[PDB]
């Protein structure tokens with residue numbers, strides 16, 4: 702169960718200190734959430750709405766925001782930026 706992020710997500714994954722170029726999703730999802738945390742994309746008062754508008758992540762995901770409860774939506778959006786080895 703492995704993927705190669707497409708370059709733009711790979712750059713985003715490296716900005717949160719990823720060292721590889723081919724990951725498990727788990728590792729992808731992990732660095733993503735870390736990115737979300739470290740770029741302050743969450744709303745502290747909505748508590749699981751990620752506001753990715755006006756940020757590389759939103760450009761990758763093609764959406765201004767999403768719930769972390771929408772597992773499929775997010776999986777879909779991630780896989781657009783991936784290539785399964």
Ligand SMILES: O=C(O)c1[nH]c2cc(Cl)ccc2c1-c1c(-c2ccccc2)ncn1Cc1ccc(Cl)cc1
Nearest residue numbers: 730731733734737738743749769771772773775776
């Ligand atoms: O646990 C993680 O590493 C994690 N990684 C993520 C990546 C994204 Cl793109 C969205 C949510 C999470 C996410 C996450 C969060 C979260 C919420 C707000 C800020 C930071 C993290 N809450 C639960 N999760 C787990 C998770 C994993 C996959 C999916 Cl599809 C949804 C939620």
